[PDB]
Amino acid sequence: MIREERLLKVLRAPHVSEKASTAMEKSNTIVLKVAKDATKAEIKAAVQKLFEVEVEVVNTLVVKGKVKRHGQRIGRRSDWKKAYVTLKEGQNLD
Amino acid sequence: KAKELREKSVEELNTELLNLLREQFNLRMQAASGQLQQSHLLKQVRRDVARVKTLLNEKAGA
Amino acid sequence: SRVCQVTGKRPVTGNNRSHALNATKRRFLPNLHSHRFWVESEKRFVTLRVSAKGMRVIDKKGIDTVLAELRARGEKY
Amino acid sequence: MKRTFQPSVLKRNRSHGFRARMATKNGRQVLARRRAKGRARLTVSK
Amino acid sequence: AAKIRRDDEVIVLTGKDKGKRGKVKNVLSSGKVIVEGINLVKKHQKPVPALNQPGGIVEKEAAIQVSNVAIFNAATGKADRVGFRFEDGKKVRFFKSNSETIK
RNA sequence: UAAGGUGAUAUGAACCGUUAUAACCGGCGAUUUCCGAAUGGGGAAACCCAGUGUGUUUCGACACACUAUCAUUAACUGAAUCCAUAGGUUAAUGAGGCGAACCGGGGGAACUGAAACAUCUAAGUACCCCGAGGAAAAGAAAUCAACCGAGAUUCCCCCAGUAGCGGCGAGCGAACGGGGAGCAGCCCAGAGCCUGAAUCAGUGUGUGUGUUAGUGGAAGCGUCUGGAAAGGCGCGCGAUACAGGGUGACAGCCCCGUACACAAAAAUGCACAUGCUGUGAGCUCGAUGAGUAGGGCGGGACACGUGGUAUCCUGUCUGAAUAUGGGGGGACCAUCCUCCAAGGCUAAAUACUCCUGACUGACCGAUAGUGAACCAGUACCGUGAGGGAAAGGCGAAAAGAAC
RNA sequence: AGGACCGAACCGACUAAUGUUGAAAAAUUAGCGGAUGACUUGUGGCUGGGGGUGAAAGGCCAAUCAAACCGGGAGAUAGCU
RNA sequence: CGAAGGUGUGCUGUGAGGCAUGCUGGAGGUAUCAGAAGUGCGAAUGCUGACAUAAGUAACGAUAAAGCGGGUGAAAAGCCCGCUCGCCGGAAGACCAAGGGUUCCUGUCCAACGUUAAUCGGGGCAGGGUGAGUCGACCCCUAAGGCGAGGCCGAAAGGCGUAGUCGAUGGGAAACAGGUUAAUAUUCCUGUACUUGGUGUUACUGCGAAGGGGGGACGGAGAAGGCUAUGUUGGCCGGGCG
RNA sequence: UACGGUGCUGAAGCAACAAAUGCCCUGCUUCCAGGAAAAGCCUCUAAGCAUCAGGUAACAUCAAAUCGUACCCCAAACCG
């Protein structure tokens, strides 16, 4: 049983995009931004407990940070994890 | 806040910590979208969790 | 290495002075020989890598005192 | 023409990597020299 | 340990506005103060569409060195220096001339 | 300590605080991901894979602790083989790696000079390795001296480029003695008499003095030029403070400071004093470091290159005396003088600065001074070890040019 | 069956031309030799400098080889310019 | 009421030089007599930076090739759309490993990069995009080889090596077809499967390795026979009568 | 219809012949130069476990984590 406070730290932010909205309205899958070290079980448990929704399966991928250029200095954005949480049929989420 | 919190039991500190963490999660989710217009609350709740954790380590195991 | 277990002798370095006084570096190794000593007190054989001078000291002092010295010096046998 | 640098990350790490340097005394001396000099990237490893 | 504080009424000692008096608006960390309506500069404020600022030749106060203003002693009508002393175990400021506590 | 803050480019937004848990500084704590001695096993560094035990479980699984190797000590166990030993398993303690220079030790060149070069020099230098400390090493005469005496070790100035050594070439180069800095003497090879008696080390408490934040800290106005006065011209005042920095041009009196006088809840350094623990002091008798000193052979260090070469160390072969004895006094012998090796410890004078604070310069001022005044061991070059730049100033204030 | 024959991929470089501040610090075009073998190639490893490796040219050892490269002795020495 | 520096002019000494001053500059300079030097530059195929020269010359990178109409724009031979032409087609097409690390897609901009113009780009800025029980890595297993408890050897550093433990380029379990995004798809969705481990009920009963055996498990060349991917032709279906 | 594409419906969907360097084939024939290792997998028992643990068959349920997945890949993106 994964701890509650750990669940309270797994989810970072909802990912907002055209593909995300399309997935939400067509495949009942929400795209969330999660912690880089989170496992599928932790993400599933965190969504099921904190949002009170039934999760079918979780798909994750690691997004590489882009190498940007602030003026003349070359810098790199932070890597982040992205999770496709597929809610069960009939469920609704904000 | 530290003085007020010091006259509390270990289980009271734990439930207070859990309430603070849930509050922090709601604030973080609210701040992700543009709904939150009070940015100082994130730092506030973070320092509160820091204080409670500090007091927990101070009381338990010492 | 080439180290006498009892006396602590080890290879030293020197020269090979020729007739024309040319000096080339050389070494002097100890005359090491592995030998089994009869420890009457323990009623067994202890094999040590000793020099000839080491054998002479073991003969003069007795094997018991030499083993005591080895134990004090932390040498394993 | 085949140039002298034919890259391979596996060979690169196995030849000039941090563990390869720390395996021997001389590699650690190289690391010590670079730490004294203040190099940003100690070894070839990414 | 600061001699000049927020609500102090000060008089300018040197510069183009020498002699004039005013209230300190806010003290900056760099050792400079902004005295109300004294060191007025004309800034050519550029328009910005967001936040709905029209953009014009605005006039506003510019900072001035603390070394150029002295506290004003209303009783004597002259500039004065600030000294520190303890009264009831609480550090207070006093005018160097007339040696009375600054309210 | 405080009326101002939420570090910088770097504004903006949302806020905290104004008489005291806003912020800032300091003491002691708490947390301290992963890699790295890396230490549970592995590895292409910042990643992969576990085992045991104790808890929870909404039975899906979670959290915490321990598990590297070696040395020493203790317990259990245990072959060939009877006892035993080797080996194995626990537990406790310690070590490992990094760091600029100094120190001691184990190895150790060549370019060069000799106008070539091999002896010799460069040189026990460069470099590699091991070990330790704030210093290290050495250290209390088997030492010099010369018939008079001195009195541990270390460092500085003379002696002295002397006496010597040397293809007697190039070069190397003392010591005796004198003047100083600093000064300290003890213990084990063994017993009795009085019993804890000097001293040292560890751990507390107390005092003094610092260190890590700080507090108070004097005395100037008018006028002229000027964008602006600290400048010019008058008249004052402070000074145990006219060191320095900043302020619209050059400020003792505008600000931060300086001279001076104060200050620690907490931690810590150094001198003391004292409590506790370990340790012994003094007297009498006894003992005086054996494969050792010396020798044959081959080297090395002494200024000394085997020379007539004393002295010290030993790779190899031998080998005493032992207080009625032995070493040294530059081959060696006699006389005489001086000392007691083959067992240890020891502060100060001495060497150096990765780092911290204060001060100083007939030291540099952006092709100079560190390679680096500037986001520099960076960009870039190279597989890699490694090499390695260029690049500072608007203005007093952005008032950085609305239209 | 064959270190057999003709001939593509693949490996190599015999002749000529061009290019020689080149498209290229050795290549392009037209021809050419081997093309089931002593062949050729991908991935990983091993052999280190007076050393390696060489069907042997003192060839090759990161565009550098009758002794690699980097740091140090080192501002070697230079009766020479 | 204008310092050093910079740039002209006049005067002066035998000379290195000196003095005064117009303009620019905007804050330091320094008599005399002494003192110390990183003390005077044209040369070193000297070092660093700047700028000429050849010269608006050579060149603009396969002789596979371009022509036109419309669109955007300040401007189109090069960008977009449309009709022709040409080139590769055992590649100059398509998918991977190695290597690179956001160069992928969308909106926007032309200062610098593209050997020309540029609205275009692998260029700048911002946003988006990588979904796995079955693909690959991780994991179990070893080759060459590395490290190596104890161990042997070596002045020290260290060399070799046993038990072990790493090391794929080889051995080991399982997924296909269709559709969809601007950018992902054997990963998403639909339909149909398969594999290996725990647990839990029922039925049956000798289980157990660090050991033994089998298997994994292996060379070069050559010759048919059966197939398939795939292609041609006929039939069928839809369209056509130039 | 934003001229980019999106939505709905949908006939035939067979046969013969040729044929691989791909598959049967880790095969067959033949030759000398005589052609990896270990694990997964099947089986056998030693200590031990004695009606326990375990094993195999069916059913149900749970689990399969972590990292890569864009783009070039005979090239304008790799090595020059």
Curated annotation (Swiss-Prot), chain D:
Alphabetically ordered keywords of this record: Ribonucleoprotein, Ribosomal protein
GO cellular component, one term: ribosome
Residue stretches spanning the membrane: none
HAMAP family: Ribosomal_bL34
Source domain of life: Bacteria
An individual GO BP term: translation
Record keyword Ribosomal protein present: yes
PANTHER family documented for this protein: LARGE RIBOSOMAL SUBUNIT PROTEIN BL34M, MITOCHONDRIAL RIBOSOMAL PROTEIN 34 FAMILY MEMBER
Family as reported in the entry's similarity comment: Belongs to the bacterial ribosomal protein bL34 family.
Record's protein name: Large ribosomal subunit protein bL34
Xref: NCBIfam families: rpmH_bact (TIGR01030)
InterPro entries in the record: Ribosomal_bL34 (IPR000271), Ribosomal_bL34_CS (IPR020939)
Single annotated GO MF: structural constituent of ribosome
Source organism of the structure: Escherichia coli O45:K1 (strain S88 / ExPEC)
